[PDB]
Write a protein that binds this ligand. Structure first.
Ligand code: TGL
Ligand code: HEA
Ligand code: HEA
Ligand code: 3PE
Ligand code: 3PE
Ligand code: 3PE
Ligand code: 3PE
Ligand code: 3PE
Ligand code: CUA
Ligand code: CU
Ligand code: MG
Ligand code: NA
Ligand code: ZN
Lengths: 104, 227, 514, 46, 49, 144, 72, 43, 47
């Protein structure tokens, strides 16, 4: 199928104001199963949905599921974080490389 | 006639079983190709880093998945039937030899003309001539000629034996009440060995078959001077 | 109380636990028998003197670990432990008949041991080819006890198959159709169908053989109009369906293991898997004369049977391709059950492909009753169904008992078992290609070296089975219970807890209305 | 009512580890050592 | 936390590897069994009547 | 202390990258400092520092995804005790060769091997590729 | 400076495409390795053996020693 | 399957004597039979 | 309906599906099938 209506219904699903952590939880659990590193607009929608009911931890888990889905090549997440950066300095969220979650 | 660290087949004398070797090498190509393919897939896709656990499509790969093993099996089976329908051609039996599998030994009958039969026992280990073999020596050998299509008519008394020589590619089960016809052709003289390939009791490991094949002038000088 | 639980049992879980115990006992019995058989082929000698007792040992090995390890453990234990738990049924439809089948198994074991006990001995191979099994070459009471052991095992298997078919078809939730059950339930469906459509020919043939031995009939005596090839036809008409009995719940267990630890919610191509397994269960009955390409059949018959053998070869390839495509991009976790499953896939694949090499009648003319055949089926049975049953037991042992095995010890067991069974069964390819016949206590010198190598490999496998008892002792030396189970939603059997109580499904499952 | 739980759905005693080790080793050793006794009895008989 | 593996993996590679290679060259060479080696190349054949 | 018998029935914590956001929190009971932490979660985020972020992540869920999938070293111990037990099997071979087996057959003697090899080369045993294809019949020595 | 957009849809599909091409070429390489190693060397051994071959001289070469039971 | 830790611990020494007891109990009747067959052959 | 406060609920939540999603349902508020979105409420008043 095509990707535009796919991304449109996903950003429609996340941006609704009546979301809860269980609904976005199951949405992210069924979104992570695709053979696809998700585009940054999806990650904006997921981050705003996670912000709307006060969770740091799930947002950092969103950032590190963008991390481990990159595989051996690590040119994905610098582009991802340079597309995510305005949400990063308006939200106060932390990348997993900076609060000490990348390290063992 | 085996030798230590032998991995392949027993080397050829009959044209039927050297064509069996050609087909054996072709199916060894096939099993090497598909075993290396599944080995590469197993060592490949267990060594990935990415995940995909969606409800993927199903009915989009079955046409190749159905036709390609059929194509491989039909190129397997075409030489199979090609050589299978070549061991049963119009016989020209220069010689007919009967054998009948006695209780842990054999008997051989050459009675096309001037009736001749003998019973082949086993040489024991403590009675061995120096330089001979263990579990593969017989006092009364089976003498055949070369370059000739010869028939073996096999039978037995009570138990199911099996007349088998792998170097000539012959193996047929000796059954009571049923004589079986097996053709044989040899291109070299010599002594070619085989053993029982059906269980027959408390000495089943102790009957060998030995085929000494010689030219025909020694057949007049041998069968004329045996009885 | 003890007698009313473990002797008068009427629930499937306790009866299945008793199949685990009896199958483990028979597995160690046949393991010891294999230790003897490889024990004097390490060095060429008459360590047991005459090879009549060697044929007794080989026949005992074959019978105890075909009908007393793999069938009880696999069919009875895993069916009675899993089939009510996957489909949601509280019990089986006929529990007393299932208990009669289980309790019929140890008299069959006792009569097989007594058949080995009598001084003539039932040394006639796994196939019971007359009149070597007749009243002149085996004049004694031993092979009659072997026949009655086969009667008891066949009747127990038939009763179990009846109960399995009626509890899959009838004891199912109403709005669930036949194509929503897990694939192990389909495996035992076609398996129990093939038991019930194969074992009457075996029972008739061995009743015929008993009547030939004792009541002076001549079904298999050609002096009175009989033919031994009638027994060969009847026996292998039973036998290759019995072969696919021995392999098909292994396919079901392997499919569940592969789709479980890979993180797949659904195995790839479920309808394709179901079609392939019904295709195997439909084509298993028209292939049996591949065991008789050296008996003297007509050439058109042999051509038809090798063609049908390739037609039964294709759906197995469909199954192995669907396994490699249900591994597709999964979150693989290296539990030892995946190690057993990968060993299953590779070694069952190479054993089956050497079977395809043996399938063509022209090559099977020269490669009949040699160790190439032994290598083919010892691969397929002796480590395909074996690694399937250790994958199932290691996977479901928290469900069966409550405690867990050590992962390091189980992976070490996989390593020692892998090295042992590969060293045991690799060089006998070259032994069979060189022309070494089966059922031989002693061999010529040129077949020595590979024999010696394979024999010490068997000892390696012996060390493997020791670790088995040790690690299961380690479970009862640790009493370490479970936190929880992953992927619990897609499997009903894990969802009543580890271990499930005596009475599960007091109130049965609720189905989607649609 | 019947007793259900971890180790209570087994016929053998679970609570003592050393007698469990002794009973499992004699049970599996009897299973292992049965064909050796059979083959030595047919060696003694013939 | 230091687990069993973090140094005992190297410890059991060292011990088990040297023990296995020592006892297998002992059982391959030092006993005196007959392997029925191939008579190609190096051994000589002697004439028999 | 003892949890109720329906522990399997309750939704349980699980840590894997297939299921990265489990339905229940890792630490279900919250302490009073963690209650103040949760109301500080209810407030704004940009006025909150790194150490209570990392302790917040450690008390909400169990561990991070970067270090749960690290390379544990159990394969080393597995292969080590493996070859240890192949070594114990070799000791079993020592005992079972010393005590169980009798003498080898007399055909394994070197002179008998020499005469039977001469017999094999004399009657041209499989002389195309198998055994007698490495023996020159002119120089009467193996092929080099 | 600025990083461009990388590949982001279905890279495992491209990985399996280039790797099933690699699987096909290594299967053909294994088959051709067995071919060139064994098969036509075996047929070449048969061809070199049989064209310079006669049964009478070979028979005499075996029967100088007296292996045969039909010639003394 | 995630596992709770051991309610009864198991140190190295009881594991060692357990595997030693298992191997000697498995090998002493088998090695008793295979250690001598000249007596069983009535030779 | 129920007789206890806990029951098996299977969801064949989209038509012609392989797998039935099995989960325990408890007394109280209705929570859905964990992948599709079909609600399920238990009423323990059936003896
Ligand atoms: C109840 C309270 C205790 C009652 C007395 C128990 C001791 C004597 C007894 O009656 O003992 C009872 C009998 C039980 O035997 C039978 O019931 C007959 C079976 C045929 O015990 C045996 O004979 C030996 C069993 C030893 C342990 C075997 C472990 C097998 C591990 C592998 C399979 C795991 C399956 C997990 C699932
Ligand atoms: C579970 C046990 C099992 C299984 C699965 C099989 C499977 C097969 N068996 Fe076998 N067989 C036995 C157990 C088994 N067998 C036993 C026990 C005996 C001897 C009994 C005795 O001692 O008397 C025996 C004997 C036996 C013989 C007799 C040899 C002789 O005695 O002379 C033959 C020959 O036709 C044969 C053939 C086959 C074939 C063709 C298959 C096939 O089903 C194998 C297919 C498996 C595969 C894994 C296919 C691989 C395909 C792919 C990987 C996909 C790619 C393919 C293409 C591109 C074409 N079997
Ligand atoms: C179930 C089928 C099966 C299995 C597994 C095996 C397994 C083995 N077989 Fe068997 N074998 C046959 C069926 C089987 N065999 C048949 C049918 C014949 C032909 C009979 C005839 O001649 O007619 C035969 C013949 C046969 C011969 C022929 C003798 C000869 O030709 O002279 C030989 C010797 O090499 C042999 C060896 C072995 C070995 C070394 C193993 C090893 O794999 C043994 C190791 C296996 C295990 C250790 C199993 C694991 C068990 C446990 C872990 C305990 C159980 C407990 C739990 C599972 C919890 N087999
Ligand atoms: C795994 C591969 C699939 C299983 C193959 C089993 C059969 C087998 O190994 O046959 C032996 C085969 C042919 O032997 P060949 O090399 O022709 O011997 C004479 C010339 N050297 O030789 C080989 O297969 C090569 C040796 C084994 C390689 C593994
Ligand atoms: C040449 C004709 C031929 O038969 O070639 C063998 C193979 C294609 O023949 P086919 O029978 O289809 O495949 C082998 C089956 N196992 O064709 C080949 O194996 C290709 C041989 C040429 C290319 C070799 C490349 C090697 C690269 C390393
Ligand atoms: C030989 C012994 C045959 C024993 C037998 O068939 O018993 C009847 C069998 C058991 O009755 P069953 O239905 O299991 O009772 C418990 C639940 N009503 O009855 C059944 O299992 C139902 C009918 C099956 C008939 C099988 C005949 C054998
Ligand atoms: C001769 C046969 C020897 C067999 C030895 C088998 C040892 C198996 C050890 C094992 O599988 O350990 C698990 C481990 C992965 O675990 P971990 O390191 O946590 O994950 C990193 C991501 N690969 O490491 C692995 O999964 C790597 C080993 C895989 C072996 C697959 C064999 C299939 C047959
Ligand atoms: C030798 C056999 C006895 C070894 C006793 C021993 O050292 O036990 C310690 C350890 C216990 O196992 P442990 O590493 O704690 O658990 C693995 C995690 N699944 O044991 C092991 O891990 C096995 C060590 C075997 C060394 C050979
Ligand atoms: Cu004649 Cu076996
Ligand atoms: Cu068959
Ligand atoms: Mg046969
Ligand atoms: Na022996
Ligand atoms: Zn649903």
């Amino acid at each position: 199928e095509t990707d535009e209506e796919f991304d449109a219904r996903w950003v429609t699903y996340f941006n609704k104001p009546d979301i809860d952590a269980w609904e976005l939880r199951k949405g992210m659990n069924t979104l992570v199963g695709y053979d696809l590193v998700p585009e940054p607009k999806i990650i904006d929608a997921a981050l705003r949905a996670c912000r709307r009911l006060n969770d740091f931890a799930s947002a950092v888990r969103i950032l590190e599921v963008v991390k481990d889905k990159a595989g051996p090549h690590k040119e994905i997440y610098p582009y991802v974080i340079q597309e995510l950066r305005p949400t990063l300095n308006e939200l106060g969220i932390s990348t997993p490389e900076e609060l000490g979650l990348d390290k063992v | 006639m085996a030798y230590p660290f032998q991995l392949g087949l027993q080397d050829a004398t009959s044209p039927i079983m050297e064509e069996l070797m050609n087909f054996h090498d072709h199916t060894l190509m096939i099993v090497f190709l598909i075993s290396s393919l599944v080995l590469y897939i197993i060592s490949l896709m267990l060594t990935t880093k990415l995940t995909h656990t969606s409800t993927m499509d199903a009915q989009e790969v079955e046409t190749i998945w159905t036709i390609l093993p059929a194509v491989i099996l039909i190129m397997i089976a075409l030489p199979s039937l090609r050589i299978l329908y070549m061991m049963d051609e119009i016989n020209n039996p220069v010689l007919t030899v009967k054998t009948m599998g006695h209780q842990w030994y054999w008997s051989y009958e050459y009675t096309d003309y001037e009736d001749l039969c003998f019973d082949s026992y086993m040489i024991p280990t403590n009675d061995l001539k120096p330089g001979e073999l263990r579990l593969l020596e017989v006092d009364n050998r089976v003498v055949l000629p070369m370059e000739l299509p010869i028939r073996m008519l096999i039978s037995s008394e009570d138990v199911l034996h099996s007349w088998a020589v792998p170097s000539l590619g012959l193996k047929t089960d000796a059954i009571p009440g049923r004589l079986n016809q097996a053709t044989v052709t040899s291109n070299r003289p010599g002594l070619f060995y085989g053993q029982c390939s059906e269980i027959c009791g408390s000495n089943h490991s102790f009957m060998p078959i030995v085929l000494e094949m010689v030219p025909l002038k020694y057949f007049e000088n041998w069968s004329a001077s045996m009885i | 109380m003890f007698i009313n639980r473990w002797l008068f049992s009427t629930n499937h879980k306790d009866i299945g636990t008793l199949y685990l115990l009896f199958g483990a006992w028979a597995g160690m019995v046949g393991t010891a028998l294999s230790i003897l058989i490889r024990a004097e082929l390490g060095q060429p000698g008459a360590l047991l003197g005459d090879d009549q007792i060697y044929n007794v040992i080989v026949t005992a090995h074959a019978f105890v670990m075909i009908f007393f390890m793999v069938m009880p453990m696999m069919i009875g234990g895993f069916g009675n432990w899993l089939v009510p738990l996957m489909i949601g049924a509280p019990d089986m439809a006929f529990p007393r008949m299932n208990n009669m089948s289980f309790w019929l198994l140890p008299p069959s074991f006792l009569l097989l041991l007594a058949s080995s006990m009598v001084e003539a001995g039932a040394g006639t191979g796994w196939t019971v080819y007359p009149p070597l099994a007749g009243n002149l070459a085996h004049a004694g009471a031993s092979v009659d006890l072997t026949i009655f052991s086969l009667h008891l095992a066949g009747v127990s298997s038939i009763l179990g198959a009846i109960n399995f078919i009626t509890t899959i078809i009838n004891m199912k939730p109403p709005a669930m159709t036949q194509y929503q059950t897990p694939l192990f339930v389909w495996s035992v469906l076609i398996t129990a169908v093939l038991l019930l459509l194969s074992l009457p020919v075996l029972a008739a043939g061995i009743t015929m053989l008993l009547t030939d031995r004792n009541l002076n009939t001549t079904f298999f005596d050609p002096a009175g109009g009989g033919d031994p090839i009638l027994y060969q036809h009847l026996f292998w008409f039973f036998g290759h369906p019995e072969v696919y009995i021995l392999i098909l719940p292994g396919f079901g267990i392997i499919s569940h293991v592969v789709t479980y630890y890979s993180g797949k919610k659904e195995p790839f191509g479920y309808m394709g898997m179901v079609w392939a397994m019904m295709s195997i269960g439909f084509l298993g009955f028209i292939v049996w004369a591949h065991h008789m390409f050296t008996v003297g059949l007509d050439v058109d018959t042999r051509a038809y049977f090798t063609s049908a053998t390739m037609i039964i070869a294709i759906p197995t390839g469909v199954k192995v391709f669907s396994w490699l495509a249900t591994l597709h991009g999964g979150n693989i976790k290296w539990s030892p059950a995946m190690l057993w499953a990968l060993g299953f896939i590779f070694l069952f694949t190479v054993g089956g492909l050497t079977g395809i090499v043996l399938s063509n009648s022209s090559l099977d003319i020269v490669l009949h009753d040699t160790y190439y055949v032994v290598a083919h089926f010892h691969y397929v049975l002796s480590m395909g169904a074996v690694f399937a049953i250790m994958a199932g037991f290691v996977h479901w042992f928290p469900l069966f008992s409550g405690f867990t095995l050590d992962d390091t010890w189980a992976k070490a067991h996989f390593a020692i078992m892998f090295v042992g069974v590969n060293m045991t069964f690799f060089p006998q390819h070259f032994l069979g290609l060189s022309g070494m016949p089966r059922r031989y206590s002693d061999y010529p010198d040129a077949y020595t070296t590979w024999n010696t190598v394979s024999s010490m490999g068997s000892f390696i496998s012996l060390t493997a089975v020791l670790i088995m008892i040790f690690m299961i002792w380690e479970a009862f030396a640790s009493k370490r219970e479970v936190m929880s189970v992953s992927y619990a939603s897609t499997n009903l059997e894990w969802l009543h807890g580890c271990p499930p109580p005596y009475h599960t499904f007091e109130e049965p499952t609720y189905v989607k209305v649609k | 009512h019947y007793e259900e739980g971890p180790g209570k759905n087994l016929p053998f005693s679970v609570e003592n580890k050393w007698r469990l080790l002794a009973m499992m080793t004699v049970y599996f050793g009897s299973g292992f050592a049965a064909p050796f006794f059979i083959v030595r009895h047919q060696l003694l008989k013939k | 936390a230091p687990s069993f593996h973090d140094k005992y993996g190297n410890a059991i590679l060292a011990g088990g590897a040297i023990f296995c290679v020592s006892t297998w060259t002992y059982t391959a060479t030092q006993i005196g069994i007959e392997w029925n080696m191939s008579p190609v190349g190096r051994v000589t054949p002697k004439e028999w009547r | 202390s003892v949890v109720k018998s329906e522990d399997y029935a309750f939704p349980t914590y699980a840590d894997r990258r297939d299921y990265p956001l489990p339905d229940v929190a890792h630490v279900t009971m919250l302490s009073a400092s963690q209650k103040a932490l949760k109301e500080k979660e209810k407030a704004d985020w940009s006025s909150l520092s790194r150490d209570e972020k990392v302790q917040l992540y450690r008390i909400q869920f169990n561990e991070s995804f970067a270090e749960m999938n690290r390379g544990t070293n159990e394969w080393k111990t597995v292969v080590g005790m493996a070859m240890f037990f192949i070594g114990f099997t070799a000791l079993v071979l020592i005992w079972e060769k010393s005590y169980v087996y009798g003498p080898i057959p007399h055909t394994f003697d070197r002179d008998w091997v020499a005469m039977q090899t001469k017999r094999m080369l004399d009657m041209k045993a499989n002389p195309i590729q198998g055994f007698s294809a490495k023996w020159d019949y002119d120089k009467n020595e193996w092929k080099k | 400076a600025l990083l461009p957009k990388p590949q982001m849809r279905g890279l495992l599909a491209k990985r399996l495409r280039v790797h099933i091409a690699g699987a096909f070429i290594v299967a053909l390489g294994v088959a051709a390795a067995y071919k060139f190693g064994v098969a036509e060397p075996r047929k070449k051994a048969y061809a070199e053996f049989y064209r310079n071959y006669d049964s009478m001289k070979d028979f005499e070469e075996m029967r100088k020693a007296g292996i045969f039971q039909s010639a003394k | 399957v995630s596992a709770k830790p051991a309610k009864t611990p198991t140190s190295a020494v009881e594991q060692a004597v357990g595997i030693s007891a298992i191997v000697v109990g498995f090998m002493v009747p088998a090695g008793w039979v295979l250690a001598h067959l000249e007596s069983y052959k009535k030779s | 309906p129920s007789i206890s406060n806990k029951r098996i609920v299977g969801c064949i939540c989209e038509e012609d599906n392989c797998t039935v999603i099995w989960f325990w349902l408890h007394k109280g508020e209705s929570q859905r099938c964990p992948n599709c979105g079909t609600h399920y409420k238990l009423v323990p008043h059936q003896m």
